[PDB]
């Protein structure tokens, strides 16, 4: 039973990280709320500069705390920016080719070949180009060059794979990320 290999993409070793920064009205951008110039793909400069601008992510702005107890003078309502993203510290990216049909040599099966150790495994996966949560195919990158840092160009994403719940200062990096290793090791 050898798979009939279809086209291939790359699923990286994904770890989620989130940041959030609070900016008062006297910061320069907060005047009467979040300016409509900020959208999901836009970025902010008061975050950590260590962030790779090329990387995938998701950004947002919101109204936050206002008062003398939240670091903003004159009790001016503030603007809080936030962002969540994923990264690959170990670079363990797996090349995935779905199994459209089986030939002797179950349904919706796929091959997920390991790149470094050349380990082979079998597990069902989504069609190339859809981010169904809970299965294989959450993060799909066209090339191995794309998935080694998860640049925003050739990778798809469902933002809800990472969670966030703001506080006065920071957020929560809630993770719904499902590792392909835990699915392919018991099924190896």
């Amino acid at each position: 039973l050898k798979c009939k290999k279809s086209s291939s993409y790359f699923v990286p070793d994904a770890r989620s990280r989130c940041t959030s920064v609070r900016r008062c009205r006297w910061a320069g951008d907060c005047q009467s709320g979040c300016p409509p110039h900020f959208t999901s793909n836009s970025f902010s400069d008061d975050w950590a500069g260590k962030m790779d601008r090329a990387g995938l992510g998701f950004s947002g702005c919101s109204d936050g705390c206002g008062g003398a107890a939240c670091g903003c003078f004159n009790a001016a309502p503030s603007c809080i920016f936030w962002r969540k993203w994923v990264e690959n510290p170990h670079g363990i990216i797996w090349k995935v080719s779905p199994c459209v049909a089986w030939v002797p040599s179950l349904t919706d099966l796929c091959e997920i070949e390991e790149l470094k150790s050349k380990k082979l495994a079998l597990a069902p996966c989504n069609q190339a180009g859809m981010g169904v949560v809970g299965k294989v195919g959450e993060i799909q990158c066209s090339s191995e060059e794309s998935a080694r840092t998860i640049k925003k160009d050739g990778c798809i994403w469902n933002a809800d794979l990472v969670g966030i719940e703001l506080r006065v200062d920071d957020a929560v990096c809630y993770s719904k990320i499902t590792s392909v290793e835990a699915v392919a090791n018991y099924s190896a």
Partner: antibody
Amino acid sequence: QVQLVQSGGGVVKTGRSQRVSCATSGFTFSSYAIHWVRQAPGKGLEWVAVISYDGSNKYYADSVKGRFTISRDSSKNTVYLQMNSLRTEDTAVYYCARSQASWQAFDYWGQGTLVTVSS
Amino acid sequence: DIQMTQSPSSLSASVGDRVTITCRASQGVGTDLAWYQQKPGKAPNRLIFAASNLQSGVPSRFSGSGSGTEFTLTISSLQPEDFATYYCLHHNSFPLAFGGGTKVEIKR
């Protein structure tokens, strides 16, 4: 104080439809998701529906599965709820709530309205 | 489907008394739980989220704990303004579900 408004309450006979609107201001409307909650008079709360930030993800309650509809207008910043094939046991008070992802809790509510059904 | 119960269906205490309320689950839901309050004639508010964390803007006297199928909210110091119906919510998976709620009233 993130604030919302709503409209569309009143009385309606059986077998018809009705619509309620929830308009928001004070946050990035593209990076959030919207929820509905109903409260029967003299009883507990109940979960209604949920819409995500792009329309890709929608989920409906089991009891009213296949009969309700939730949508959002990313331009005017208002969420519309449409109820079809009404009955006389849907009477409650309705509220509109917000969340970041489709699966976290709620953070802020609105003021709610009354929707009444009888013959 | 899955169910969620509360205990007990009605409590009562005077000023300063410590009160415990429990929400019991037919299955372990991890830490995905929250607690909600409605004072009479208002929209609800949120107090405790992620089963251990307190919402900002809430007085710290409210607290909750638990895991799996054992969840308990405890109010160390009780005041008449706290008197509302408290509901437990879970968000482990769709469909979500509220609780039957627990009513707190004055003893006299």
